[PDB]
Amino acid sequence: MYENLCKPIKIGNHLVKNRMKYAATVDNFCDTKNGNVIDREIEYLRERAKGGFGIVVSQGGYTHILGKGYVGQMGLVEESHLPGLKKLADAINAEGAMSIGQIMHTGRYGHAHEYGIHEAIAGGKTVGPEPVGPTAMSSPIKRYSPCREMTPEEIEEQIQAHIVAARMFKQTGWKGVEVCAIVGYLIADFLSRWTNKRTDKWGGSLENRARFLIEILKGIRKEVGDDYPLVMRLNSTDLIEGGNTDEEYIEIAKMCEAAVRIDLFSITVGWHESPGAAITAEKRPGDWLHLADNWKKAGIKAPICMAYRMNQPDVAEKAVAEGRIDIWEMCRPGIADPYLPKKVCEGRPEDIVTCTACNQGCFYYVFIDAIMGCMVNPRVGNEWDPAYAINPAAKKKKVLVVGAGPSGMECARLAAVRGHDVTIMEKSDSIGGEVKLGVKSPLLYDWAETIRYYKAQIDKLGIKLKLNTEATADSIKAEAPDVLVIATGGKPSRPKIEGIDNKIVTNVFDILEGKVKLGDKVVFIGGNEISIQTAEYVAEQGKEVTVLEKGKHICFDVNIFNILQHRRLMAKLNMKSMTNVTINEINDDGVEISTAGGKDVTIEADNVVVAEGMDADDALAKAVGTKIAPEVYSIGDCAGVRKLYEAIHDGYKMGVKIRG
Ligand SMILES: CC(C)(COP(=O)(O)OP(=O)(O)OC[C@H]1O[C@@H](n2cnc3c(N)ncnc32)[C@H](O)[C@@H]1OP(=O)(O)O)[C@@H](O)C(=O)NCCC(=O)NCCSC(=O)c1ccc2ccccc2c1
Ligand SMILES: Cc1cc2nc3c(=O)[nH]c(=O)nc-3n(C[C@H](O)[C@H](O)[C@H](O)COP(=O)(O)OP(=O)(O)OC[C@H]3O[C@@H](n4cnc5c(N)ncnc54)[C@H](O)[C@@H]3O)c2cc1C
Ligand SMILES: Cc1cc2nc3c(=O)[nH]c(=O)nc-3n(C[C@H](O)[C@H](O)[C@H](O)COP(=O)(O)O)c2cc1C
Ligand code: SF4
Numbered sequence: 001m002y003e004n005l006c007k008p009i010k011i012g013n014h015l016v017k018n019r020m021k022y023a024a025t026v027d028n029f030c031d032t033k034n035g036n037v038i039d040r041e042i043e044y045l046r047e048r049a050k051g052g053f054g055i056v057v058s059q060g061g062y063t064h065i066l067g068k069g070y071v072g073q074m075g076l077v078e079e080s081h082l083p084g085l086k087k088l089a090d091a092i093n094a095e096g097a098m099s100i101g102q103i104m105h106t107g108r109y110g111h112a113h114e115y116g117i118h119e120a121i122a123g124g125k126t127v128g129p130e131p132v133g134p135t136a137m138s139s140p141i142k143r144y145s146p147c148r149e150m151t152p153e154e155i156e157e158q159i160q161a162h163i164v165a166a167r168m169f170k171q172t173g174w175k176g177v178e179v180c181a182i183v184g185y186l187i188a189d190f191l192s193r194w195t196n197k198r199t200d201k202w203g204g205s206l207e208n209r210a211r212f213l214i215e216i217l218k219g220i221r222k223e224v225g226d227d228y229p230l231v232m233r234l235n236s237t238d239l240i241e242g243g244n245t246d247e248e249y250i251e252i253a254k255m256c257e258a259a260v261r262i263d264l265f266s267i268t269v270g271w272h273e274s275p276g277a278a279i280t281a282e283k284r285p286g287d288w289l290h291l292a293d294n295w296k297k298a299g300i301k302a303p304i305c306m307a308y309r310m311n312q313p314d315v316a317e318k319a320v321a322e323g324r325i326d327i328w329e330m331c332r333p334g335i336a337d338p339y340l341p342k343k344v345c346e347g348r349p350e351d352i353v354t355c356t357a358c359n360q361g362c363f364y365y366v367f368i369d370a371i372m373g374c375m376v377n378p379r380v381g382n383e384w385d386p387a388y389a390i391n392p393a394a395k396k397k398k399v400l401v402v403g404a405g406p407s408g409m410e411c412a413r414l415a416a417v418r419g420h421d422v423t424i425m426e427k428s429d430s431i432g433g434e435v436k437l438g439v440k441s442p443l444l445y446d447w448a449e450t451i452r453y454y455k456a457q458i459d460k461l462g463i464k465l466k467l468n469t470e471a472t473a474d475s476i477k478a479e480a481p482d483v484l485v486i487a488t489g490g491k492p493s494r495p496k497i498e499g500i501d502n503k504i505v506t507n508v509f510d511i512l513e514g515k516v517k518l519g520d521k522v523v524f525i526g527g528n529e530i531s532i533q534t535a536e537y538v539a540e541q542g543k544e545v546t547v548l549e550k551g552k553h554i555c556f557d558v559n560i561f562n563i564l565q566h567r568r569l570m571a572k573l574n575m576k577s578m579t580n581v582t583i584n585e586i587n588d589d590g591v592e593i594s595t596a597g598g599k600d601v602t603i604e605a606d607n608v609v610v611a612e613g614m615d616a617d618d619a620l621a622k623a624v625g626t627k628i629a630p631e632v633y634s635i636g637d638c639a640g641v642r643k644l645y646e647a648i649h650d651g652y653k654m655g656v657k658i659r660g
Contacts, residue, residue, distance in 0.1 A: 001347040002313060004320040005328060009303065011055070012229030012263035014175055016098050016327075019320055020341040021055035022048045023266070023307050023331040024102040024180065024233070027372035028072030028365075029381060032115075035062065035075020037084030040371075042091050043384035048334050049095030052341035055327070056097040058088065058169075060104020060180045063161035065120050066132050067186060069106025071369035076103060076165035082172055089173035100176040100231060101169030103162055107186030108133045108147045108195065109272065114369075123153035133189045134212075135197040140273055143367075155202055155212065158186070163219040176229035176263070179216060184271035187213050188235065191252060194243045210252050214259045221260040231264035232256065236291035236306075239274035246291070250298045262302040266329055267291060269308045279308060279332075280565040281357040281443045285315035292325045305329035311355045311446070313344050335362050336376050350456040353377060354449035359561035360645055367560065375645045376450065378410075378652035387656075393418045394660030400425065400481035400629070402471040402620065405433025407636025407647040407654075408487030409454045414655020415483075416461035423479065424463060427470040431455060433489050434637075435644070437512035441533040442540050443565060473624045483658055484629040486621045487651070490614035490637035497525070497610065499586035504608045508534045511609060519606020520544055523591055525583055527554030529643075531611035532566055539573040546576040546603055548593060550612075553579055557643075578603075586610075614641045631658075 009016050029041040041059075049056045061076035062068040068075075075081050085101070092099040110131030112120065117129040132154065133147040150158070166177045181187040189195040190212040196203040203209055220230060234253055237246050244252075256262050269288055270278035277283055288308045295304055303326035310316055316328035333340055337353035344352075353376050361373035361380060374380035382388040397420050401412045404426035416422045430436055432451045439447040458465050469475070476484060492507035494500060510516040511534055520543055524535045527549030539545040547554055554577050555566050570577065580596035590605035618638050626632045635650040 002317050002344045005313060005317050006345040007320075009054070009326060011098065011176065011231065011303070013227055014098055014229050016054040017096060018052070018054040018341060018345065019327045020053050020344065021305055021327050021329040022053040022057060022334040023329050024057040024060050024104070024178065025331050025335065025362075025372075026059040026070045026073055026366060027381065028070055028369065029372065030059075030072045030074045032072045034080065035068070035073060035077070036081060037074060037088045039384045040381060041074070042088055044381060045088060046091040046095065047379070047383045048338045049092045049097035051334070051338035052345065053097050053334065054341070055100055056092045057100045057178060058102050058174075060102040060185075061165060063103060063105045063158060063165050064122070065117055066110050066112050066122060066127075066129070067105030067107065068115060069109045069111055069185075070366060071115060072371070073106075076168055077161070082168060085168060085172040085174070093173060093175065098175045099173070100178050100229070101174040102178040102180050103165040104180035105158065105161075105186040107131060107184070107189045108137075108139065109144055109184055111145075113145070123151045123157050125151070132186070133195060134203055135195060137195065144273070152200065152202070159212070159215045159219055162216040163223050166220040167223050170224050170228060176231055177220060177224060178266070179213070179220065179230075179232040181213055182233045182235050182268045184273055187216065188238075188271070192238060192240065192243050194240050206248060206251060207255065210255050213252070214255060217256055217260045226261070229263045230260060231266065232262060233266040233268055235269070235271075236267040236288075236295065237269055239270040239276045239278060243271070246294065250295060250300070253295065253300055254298070257301055264327070265295070265300060265302050265304045267295060267304060267306050277565065277568065279357065279363075280359070280561070281446060282565055282568065283309040285310050285312040286319065289319055289324050292319075296324065303327060307331055309357065311357070313340075313349050313352070332357065332362055335372075335374050335380055350452065353453055354446060356444070356446040356450065358644075360559055363561050364559040373645070376648060378649045390414065390417060390656060393420055393658065396420055397482040397658060397660065398480070399423070399483045399485065399658060400476065400479050401485045401487060402476075403433065403487035403489060403636070403638070404431040404465070405487055405489045405636060405647065406435050406450070406644060407489075407651040408433070408485065409458070410648050410651025411485050411487065411635060411654040412463050413454070413457050413461065414652055415658050416463050418655070418658070420658060422461075422463045423466065423481070424458070425466045425469045425471040425475070427468070429468055431458070431465070437509065438533065440512055441537045442569060443536065444533060471620060473628065476624055476628055481629050483631045484624070484633070485654060486632070486634045486638055487636045488617045488620050488638040490641045491617040492611065493613045493615045495610065495612050497583055497586055500610060502586050502588065502608070504588060504590070504605065505586055506607050506609055508609065508611045511538065516607070518543060521590075521605050522607045522609065523548060523603050523605035524609045524611055525591065526611040526613065527551065527556065527577065527579065528611070528613065529555065529557045530614065531609070532558070534609065534611060535575065536566075536569060536573065539575050545573070546578070548581050548583065548591065548603065549577070549579045550581060550583060551579065616641055
């Protein structure tokens with residue numbers, strides 16, 4: 001089934017069992033006080049190695065405190081870091097994965113001041129805690145603070161720190177070393193003409209900008225020796241106006257191959273300051289592969305790997321078959337499903353927990369300096385935690401799950417995996433709940449992969465699925481289960497708006513279930529994530545859509561990464577939006593609003609969607625109490641409206657805790 005992806009490959013002298021590589025992922029799982037590797041990190045990475053990845057990369061470790069860019073970033077500076085690095089290599093290696101350690105000074109993106117640092121020693125001098133770069137400059141975005149210009153002594157010290165980092169990996173049993181020269185971190189800062197205005201030997205010509213990197217590479221090669229695998233990450237495109245050209249990145253790669261033997265090139269897209277889409281759902285699998293072709297035709301010797309929205313095994317298999325890339329590299333597909341390679345090579349891709357590119361538990365949580373999680377994978381960061389262990393149930397119980405939404409389906413899946421006798425009662429003709437409605441939205445196409453996964457799991461686990469079956473107090477009593485799990489989700493709210501009872505008024509459920517025929521002018525009251533995604537579905541059908549928000553911003557419940565993707569799509573779809581508006585009335589003609597400036601205006605509509613929020617659909621839970629069955633639980637939105645992350649996590653927590 002996946003002959004090309006499951007084919008072995010030599011990386012330097014080391015033979016890798018397949019073409020699937022798990023990419024570097026800073027997750028804030030390391031000790032925030034000192035950069036030490038701890039059990040949370042060991043177990044996270046051990047699971048990707050158990051999952052069958054041929055190559056497992058560590059997160060990028062800072063070579064100096066000023067280069068620490070995440071609250072729990074791994075350190076590569078002191079002798080005290082060596083024990084944890086050994087423990088991490090042993091855990092990855094024992095699984096038969098090639099352990100590769102990554103070196104990553106975050107440069108201009110450093111946040112030492114926020115991590116309780118007020119002073120440090122750099123280039124033999126006491127300096128402030130500000131981030132460092134080849135040139136003193138500011139960032140076009142708030143997140144990153146103005147950087148200080150490194151002295152040549154600081155530049156020389158960093159080459160030495162990179163060599164030391166490489167030595168630390170080799171002595172602790174790591175099978176290879178990866179130099180992170182991407183996305184706007186320190187090396188990428190010296191490489192790009194946008195960030196490097198230096199007039200000495202470290203900037204100017206392309207060779208001068210590449211000198212820091214070449215010196216780091218030459219230094220590492222001399223230290224680790226000729227037989228040790230030395231790999232690297234380099235941009236194929238920075239998506240920065242005034243940055244380096246795509247051909248320039250190829251010329252840099254050729255400078256690297258000419259100085260040291262490079263055993264693998266990981267090719268990347270964008271900088272964190274890039275205004276364009278790189279990793280969102282706007283990018284489909286294979287949208288970046290032409291870049292790999294250009295590296296191949298330029299004559300790059302070393303094997304090449306590429307990630308960047310490559311979440312589909314069929315797209316990657318073809319890419320490797322055609323020799324476009326030698327290795328399918330991935331980060332978020334491996335966060336979502338650490339067993340993706342084991343599933344690919346056993347020929348069971350219907351079992352894959354696909355990454356939906358929601359950027360919540362991964363990108364968002366890490367950038368807001370929180371412990372990394374995952375929407376579709378509740379085990380992310382919890383692999384080390386005994387409360388998340390999946391153990392067979394001693395005595396089998398009759399488990400009744402009410403509702404085939406994501407919380408109910410995750411609970412049912414875990415309870416059946418652990419050996420319970422599980423039944424799901426679903427009031428509609430299909431599974432998925434609000435996920436089934438959401439999949440109609442332009443950016444939520446990968447939600448069909450979530451429906452596919454659960455449908456295949458229910459089948460395989462022998463869960464008794466009862467569709468078109470509304471659970472009532474009497475049908476529960478007839479079923480007589482040992483455990484009742486209520487997962488009836490949420491329902492659109494009905495705020496106290498004048499003229500809400502008007503026939504022009506509809507809701508998000510009616511739109512997405514096809515229970516309403518819409519006109520040409522459609523007006524949405526509410527600017528939350530759900531309202532926006534239903535509005536985007538309506539506008540994509542070539543209709544005139546206006547979104548009215550009483551609060552200060554639209555997409556107020558949307559994470560920082562997805563905010564941009566909605567701005568781009570609402571512009572492309574010619575969508576109108578108004579914030580700080582007072583909704584006065586809904587009438588036959590549309591909705592009467594008063595702006596914050598005091599202007600009374602009529603928003604003309606054929607349909608008015610009242611989408612201000614969701615209420616818990618808890619009527620069943622209130623009707624039956626806590627005594628209808630020996631154990632009664634409410635999970636997901638019916639227990640209090642939250643979002644998908646909390647629904648899938650509630651489901652998992654419920655499924656693992658059902659006792660025997
Ligand atoms: C989520 C951000 C990281 C930060 O956003 P934030 O809201 O925190 O920005 P800020 O607080 O500074 O406010 C700036 C304003 O501009 C907007 N904005 C922020 N970043 C922007 C941007 N990059 N382009 C255009 N506009 C941007 C933002 O919505 C906001 O609007 P406002 O609320 O009305 O003031 C954002 O810059 C962003 O999504 N950038 C694109 C990320 C990207 O594609 N990177 C390359 C692919 S990922 C990659 O290769 C990589 C490599 C190493 C990594 C290591 C660790 C973690 C991730 C890594 C990823
Ligand atoms: C258009 C849209 C877009 C969204 N976008 C996002 C997003 O981008 N990010 C995010 O985090 N969240 C998003 N959400 C919210 C997210 O989908 C929900 O939070 C999540 O589905 C809640 O899961 P749940 O299992 O608790 O409930 P539900 O998904 O609502 O499932 C409940 C299920 O129970 C069934 N049911 C109800 N009563 C009974 C009964 N008595 N007997 C039997 N079955 C019954 C229903 O038919 C349904 O299948 C979106 C929702 C919608 C509608
Ligand atoms: C939470 C998170 C942390 C990341 N940390 C690193 C890192 O330490 N080093 C690195 O080179 N890339 C890092 N990346 C980038 C990924 O390795 C990957 O190249 C990128 O997310 C695109 O691939 P994908 O679509 O498979 O996720 C990170 C990405 C995420 C989601
Ligand atoms: S949190 Fe969302 S984007 Fe990140 S790995 Fe999980 S499903 Fe993918």
